Structures are given as structure tokens and as C-alpha cells.
Amino acid sequence: PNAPACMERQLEAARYRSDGALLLGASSLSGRCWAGSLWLFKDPCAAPNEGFCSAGVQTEAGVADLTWVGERGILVASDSGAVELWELDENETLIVSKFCKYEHDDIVSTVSVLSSGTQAVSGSKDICIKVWDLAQQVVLSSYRAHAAQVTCVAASPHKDSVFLSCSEDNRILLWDTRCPKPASQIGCSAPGYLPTSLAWHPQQSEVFVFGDENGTVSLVDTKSTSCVLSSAVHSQCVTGLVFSPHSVPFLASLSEDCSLAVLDSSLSELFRSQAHRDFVRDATWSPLNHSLLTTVGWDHQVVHHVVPT
Amino acid sequence: RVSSGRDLNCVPEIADTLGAVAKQGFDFLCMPVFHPRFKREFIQEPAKNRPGPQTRSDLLLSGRDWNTLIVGKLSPWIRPDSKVEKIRRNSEAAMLQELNFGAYLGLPAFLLPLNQEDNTNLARVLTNHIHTGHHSSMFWMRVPLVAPEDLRDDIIENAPTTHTEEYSGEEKTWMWWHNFRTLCDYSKRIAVALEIGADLPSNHVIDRWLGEPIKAAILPTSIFLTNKKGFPVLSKMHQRLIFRLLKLEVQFIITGTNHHSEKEFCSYLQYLEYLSQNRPPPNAYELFAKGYEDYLQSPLQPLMDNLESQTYEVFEKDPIKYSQYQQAIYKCLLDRVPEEEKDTNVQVLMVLGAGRGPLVNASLRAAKQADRRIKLYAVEKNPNAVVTLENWQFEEWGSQVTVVSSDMREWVAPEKADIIVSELLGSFADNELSPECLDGAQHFLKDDGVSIPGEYTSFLAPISSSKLYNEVRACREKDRDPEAQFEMPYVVRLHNFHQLSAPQPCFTFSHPNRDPMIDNNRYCTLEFPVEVNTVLHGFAGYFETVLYQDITLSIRPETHSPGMFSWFPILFPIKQPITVREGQTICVRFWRCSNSKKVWYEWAVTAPVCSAIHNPTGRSYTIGL
Ligand SMILES: Nc1nc2cnc(C(=O)N3CCOC[C@@H]3c3ccc(C(F)(F)F)cc3)cc2c2c1COC2
Ligand SMILES: CSC[C@H]1O[C@@H](n2cnc3c(N)ncnc32)[C@H](O)[C@@H]1O
Secondary structure (H helix, E strand, C coil): CCCCCCCCCEEEEEEECCCCCEEEEEECCCCCCCCEEEEEECCCCCCCCCCCCCEEEEECCCEEEEEECCCCEEEEEECCCEEEEEEECCCCCCEEEEEEEECCCCCEEEEEECCCCCEEEEEECCCCEEEEECCCCEEEEEECCCCCCEEEEEECCCCCCEEEEEECCCCEEEEECCCCCCEEECHHHCCCCCEEEEEECCCCCCEEEEEECCCEEEEEECCCCCCCEEEECCCCCEEEEEECCCCCCCEEEEECCCCEEEECCCCCEEEEECCCCCCEEEEEECCCCCCEEEEEECCCCEEEEECCC | CCCEEEECCCCCCHHHHHHHHHHHCCCEEEEECCCCCCCCCCCCHHHHCCCCCCCCCCCCCCHHHHHHCEEEECCCCCCCCCCCHHHHHHHHHHHHHHHHHHHHHCCCEEEEECCCCCCHHHHHHHHHHHCCCCCCCEEEEEEECCCHHHHCCCCECCCCCCCCCCCCCCCHHHHHHHHHHHHCCCCCCEEEEEECCCCCCCHHHHHHCCCCCEEEEEEEHHHCCCCCCCCCCCCHHHHHHHHHHHHHCCEEEEECCCCCCCCCCHHHHHHHHHHHHHCCCCCCHHHHCCCCECCCECCCCCCCCCCCHHHHHHHHCCHHHHHHHHHHHHHHHHHHCCCCCCCCCCEEEEEECCCCCHHHHHHHHHHHHHCCCEEEEEEECCHHHHHHHHHHHHHHHHHHEEEEECCCCCCCCCCCEEEEEECCCECCEHHHCHHHHHHHCHHHEEEEEEEECCEEEEEEEEEECHHHHHHHHCCCCCCCCCCHHHHCCEECECCCCEECCCCEEEEEEECCCCCCCCCCCEEEEEEEECCCCEEEEEEEEEEEEEEECCEEEECCHHHCCCCCCCCCCEEEEEEEEEEECCCCEEEEEEEEEECCCEEEEEEEEECCCECCCECHHHCCCCEEC
16 A cells, blocks of 8 residues: 555554544664654554555654654654654655654654644753754754753643653753743652653643653652652553543553553552563554553554553 | 764664765764664563564674674663663673674674763673673773763753862763773773763863873764854864874764755765864874884893894984084084194094994094094994994094994003093983993093083973873783883883873983992982872883083973984883872882892882882892993
């Protein structure tokens, strides 16, 4: 279907958009050719199957992270030191690149589109965070606040000027481009094990969760800067954190112990899935029914878990 | 004239990326042997059995390509000094894995990051890997000039950067390197890959890396500017630093993306190579002595030994040196005999230690341009060099030059000396026993006779050179004291070193000595103010000599005779390096000792920390009488 023959083994990200079509990002982390590709499956159950795809293009380097831009655009965090925006056509059969800007000096590790949809923030192993204008294909701002490679950036919901960022310098930075000093460090993790993942709570402006490298998940009231609620969820680095699109969101964590876990508000534990044999890399809930949660892995499986609410 | 490398952290295909890197003008490529994002688990049972190849084939490159073109990079997720245990042991097993794959490929160099203070567990795994097989591959430690914490933008509201001067805190990355190598016991396979920041640090911080084994300089594309034409350029401050590196012949390596549409990485090198041409070629002395840089040698001992034919040849390849001698004699001749006594008073000149006779000929040219008459004795104890003299007396000198084959201390002279001329000085002036020689030869110098050179002075200066400290440390030999290499001096054109204080006079000798009682034993006690934090590795030695009046010869850098490459500086090492704080004083003590058979130097450090007395009783180094 105008797509490459096979895709790469290391499934690195999975995203659902509004209508229920599954986005997939894979990179060839091992082997002769280290590249990546982008895939769209309007049918979520045939996702690992290349031939049963809706669209599929193949990029130059690895896909370290991706995110949706609107409903027909993909923002790519590529190993080549570039952020890439690809956009489906009207038929949604071909995926064509909109731009490819090489502004980071190292691997672009994380990227997140802001609440306005017109801007996006990216973090990379060069310790720099850049603010991007997705219309004029330029960098709006060059922020260099950390002292170690940037692990995760998470755009705030409903605030087009706030976002999170965590680095291996043990810092979590609450960003607000409105303030003269736009970055604000969180004093909670003064000796805390390095943060690895960030997820704003959808309902609350000031609530977000981070995951450390020791497998501990904690949520913090940001405004108060009070004592967080913590819980040992995993045994390795917590790779990502996603909230369910419910009215009372469940917290789905995923880590390098190959296990997926879903949590509640008090961070208690409702469901594990051990179905993955390798690292789990991304989570995205189905917006069509809210008990399906699909997660990919480096074992090249997409697993449609039924979240027993 | 510049060797450069391309630092990438992204290869889709080696042969296609390396082919690209080659056409742009690069001599080698720094790349990750394993995918930088390929975190591997070695213990934890769900992920340990990850199927498939762990990395790309070695068959993708030829054998000589891996050996000469590729510099390995250790994956950024490897963190052996993590506070989490599971991350430590994974990083351990993976660091061994990546390193073992580099040795499997025969790579010439491997890049390792020094991005925090504690790399103790890092140094350890590395050391074990060094001590598993006996190999010669180098390990380039990335250390930036300025730490990532001290360069971050002051854009955090509640964590402002420290605006104060942390004199020792601005040198903190050097402490990362120094502590790492000291843990690794100064392995010759571990060198520095200095990363140059967008904004340079203080001058002392740059000076800190003088004398360190810097094999590479990392130049990120971000530090470059844009001239009026729109091409990458460098500031004068930055350019001076590069010029300094050019002197150490480091390899220059570009990292990061190029922001220029006019793209092409050759321009980044076009400017860099361009700089090499701009640096002046040569420095005159530098041209001739090339390849002798930091080359350890035992000081020559013309007395105890007989010099070869080709070391006399290199002696004569310096006209400047003889011109001073020629001039000193010249000036002296006029001084001793007036214009009316010109053709009646013939002067007895004696070249003690004629070698192959450059001094005897310079003494001839001096007499001609002075229009005074000279009788010349050419005295030489080396029987092999005497053959050159007698062939050259017969063919051309004639009966004006009398060749004497004997030791000047033994030789009975028929005539008394109007002037004696000597070339006996060594690198450390008197290390060749010129005092004792000229002393025993004063008896045939008349009471108003002039000796050339009249005096000579030895100078000393403390130096810092981790580079040079290994070379001595590598000088251990079998069937001898394992530390005897530290208790002996070396003649060596000092290059990658840092002088820690102004050279101070050490020993002085005046000829004729006269004196009721001649004693060449010497005690001299020196104190060197140090204005920088550093590590003491040894003491460089130079000498100044006054042939006659104003004319002089000198290798002391402040008064170095221009254009003279005849002598190299001497280096006195110490067994154990000594750390020195800013404002501390380096007090060193030197002794010239002697019995009836031999003369030697003893030395010790009594400054910040005491040091064992070196070469006691001459147990490790003698100068045979
Ligand atoms: N009585 C003496 N002793 C000496 C001891 N040492 C030296 C000395 O420095 N070197 C001689 C032995 O190799 C090291 C060094 C040297 C090597 C190469 C070059 C080159 F090729 F670059 F030019 C120059 C210097 C010189 C001495 C001289 C005299 C008399 O005048 C010269
Ligand atoms: C150009 S080096 C000085 C020369 O003086 C010679 N020399 C050193 N000591 C004596 C000595 N006691 N008598 C004669 N020649 C000497 C050395 O062998 C060398 O050829």
C-alpha cells in the first residue's frame, strides 16, 4: 500500500487520535540499517502487520519520540538531531514530510505539542530545549537550563505556554514562557532517583506525575509544592506515564521491567500486564471505548489490553 | 597539515555514512559501536533474552577501516556510577561489552565521557579491561573545559547560577580527569579529549590542561560564528586556544550538526585547516628538532664515553653557537695584545676538548679578523675524533695547530696558555664535569690567562607534565631498582609541559677557579612561588654561560640565545607527583656530590610535601670522572 516492505523491530511509540486510528513509530535499533518509519492503522487490531496498513512512510533515522499535530500531522523526534513534521494527504494514504530542521546537536529524545497546537517543545541529549513554530519551520527559543541530557518534555494541557521537563541532572523544571526566568525547579526531588517520565493530569492544571529510574511513581501538586504521594510501581526505569481519557482518569505506567501497570488516583494498583517480552515504550488509550489501552514494545507486539475498570 | 575527525551520534549505514564523512575532508569518524538508544538488560529475566543481533556486523567495513578510520563511542545510557544498583551492574556489563567489541574490531581509539565528578566505578571497569589483554588502543576521555552545570543558562527562577568566582571550582573538570587517571594509575592508554565550550573559561582553567595528555580537541558547531560572507569562523580568543593546541599536534574533531544551509562540513574544516597555514611555519628551532619533542634521552657524557662521529656532526650544524665562541675569542684577543704588539706577541690558544675541531677553526677565524697572531693547541682525549683532527692539521691547518691526544687533566703542556677555550658545558651547565676538567687544566694556563667560557650558571624551574611523568615511569628496566628511572636526569626537548615558576639560578662555576682550595661540591636551596593549582612532576634545567664579556650562550627561556638549537633542556624527575595549591611555595634543594671517582646530583622536595632524597650516594646516576 505505497509503504515499505517490512517495518523495524523496535516499536517506540503508539498514539491514538480522535477518530480511533492508531499511529505507530518504529526504529531499527539493531542490525545493518539504523533508520525508522511512521505508520497509520485505521484498524487497531492489524497494527503489527505492515501489509494491512492505511499509510506508511520511512524516515532517515530512528524515531526516538513522536506526537500528533492536529489530526493529520505527526511531529517526529529523530535520531539525526532533527525534529520532523509529516502530514497525511487528503486521502490519508501517503505520509509526506512538511519540514526537517536540524537544530539539536544530539539525539532529539522527546517532543510534545502544546495546547495551542501551533507550537511544540522538544528535548534532546544536547541538554537544550527548543520552542518550535510549526508554521514557519523555525525555532522560537533556545533554552539551555539543564546540565544533563533531557529525558522527557510534557506540554501542559489548556496552557499554551507551560510545560514540564526532566533531565538526568536530577532536575524537574516547570516552564512558563511568560516569566522572565521561564524555568522553575521542583525541590521535592532533592535526593530523588533521577526522573524519567512526566504526565500532566488532564483535569487539573497543577497536578502531574513523574517516574523515576528506581520504578517509583509519584504525583505532585505543583502549586503547593507539598509532599508528594509515592508508590513503588515497577522495578526498572519508568519509561512513560499516561492518563486515561476518563472523567476520573486512571494512571497507566510503563517501565523497562517489561510490565504495564494501571493506577488510580491514590496510585493504588488495578492491573498489570506481563504480556510484553521486551521493553514497553508507549501507551495510548482508545478514545472509541475507554477500557481499551494499547501498548507497544521492542518485542514488536501491540497488545490491546482490556482495562478492568 | 591538520588531522580532523567527525563526531557523530547517528549512523543509519556505516559504509554510506563513512563514505560521506570521507568526501567532506575527514581523517576519521567517531561513531557509536552500538545504537546509543539500545539499552540492553543483562540480568533481569524478561529482557535479558532479547533476540536478534546486539549490533551491526563487523563485515560492513574492511579490516584496515576499523583500524584506522573509526573511533568508538560508549553508549550515553552506560552509567556505572549511578546510585541505583541495577543501573550500575547493567552499565558495568554493558561497558565491558562495548569495550570488548572495540578491541574485537581493533579500533584505534574509544571515547568515554567524563561528565560528572564521580567516575570511580567507571575507572575500575575500564582498568580491568586494560588489564585483561595487552593492547595499545587508546581511550579518549571526553572532558569539557567548563562543566555542564557551570555553563547552563541563568533561566531558572529559584536556582540562579553562582555569579561569584570559584577559583578552584572553575577548575572542577580537571579534577574529574585527574582523579580518574590517578585511579587508573596513569595508564598510557588513557588520554584527554578536551571539549571546547561556546564560551571559554578563565585563563588559569585553560592553563590547567598544559602538560596533560591531550590527544584530541572537540569543537562543537555551536561555538562557530558567521563572517560577513556567511561562513563559520572563530573569535580571536577561541583562535588563540586552537593555536595553542596546534602546537601539541592534537587531532581536531567536529561535533554537533551544522546550522548553515550553505551547509558542507568542509568549510568548518576549511577554516580550521586554514588556521594551520596562518600559524607561522616554522619557529626555526622547531623545524630542525622535529620528532625530538618530549623524547627522553640520557644526557651525553663526553668525558666517561667517546662521542660518535654523527653527534659531533649535529654539534657543528649550529653556526650561531660557534659564532659566539668566535666572537669571544676575537674580543679577547684585542684586549690582551695592543696594536703595536700585534705582530710580535703571539698568543697561545688551547681548545680543550676540540672534538672534530669546530672550536679550533673558529679560533682561527677570530684571529684573522682580529689581525693578531695565535699559536693554537688542539687538545682532545677521544682517540677517534683525533683522527679527524690530524687529517685536518696535515691537509690544511699545518703547523699552526698542534693536535694533542690526551686528557687535559693529565696533559703536560710545553707552553703556558694565553687563552684556554672549552666547549665542555652540558644541558645543566656542569653536568659534564666541565669544572673538574678545567680545574685540572688551570696549571698550564698562565697567571693572567683568560678561560672561555669564564663562568657558567645552571638554572632550575619546576614543571607540570603528566605526559612526561609517564615516559619516565615507563623507563623501568629489568635487573635494576624499579624506581631508579626516577632518580636520574634526562636531556629532552620539553614540549607538553607547564612551567610553574621563573627559572632560578642553581649552580655557578668560574674559570680560572683560583681560590686557596677548590671544591666543586655544591648546596643550593631554592623556593619557587606558584600562583596556580597544579601537580609537580619534575624540575626543568637550563644553563647560561658567559664565554667572554658580553658574549654569552643560553638555553634559559628568558635569555635564550636566539636561533641556537645546540642544547636541549634537562629534566630532573621525582618519584611521586606532588599536588600544589595556588599561592604555595615550591622549595627544592639540590646537591652536587662527588668522590674521587664520580660526580652526581642529589635532590629533594621540601615544599608543600616532602619527597624522598633522589639519587642518594649516586646509587642510580653517576657522571664518571
Ligand atoms: N659538551 C656538549 N654537550 C652537549 C650535550 N647535549 C647536547 C644536546 O642537547 N643534545 C645532544 C644529544 O641529543 C639531544 C640533544 C640534541 C639533539 C638533536 C638536536 C638537533 F638535531 F635538533 F639539533 C639538538 C640537540 C648538546 C651538547 C653540546 C655540547 C657542545 O655543544 C653542544
Ligand atoms: C664538543 S664536546 C667537548 C669535547 O671535549 C672532550 N673532552 C671531555 N673531557 C675531556 C678531557 N678531560 N680532556 C680532553 N678532552 C675532553 C669530549 O670528549 C668532547 O670531544
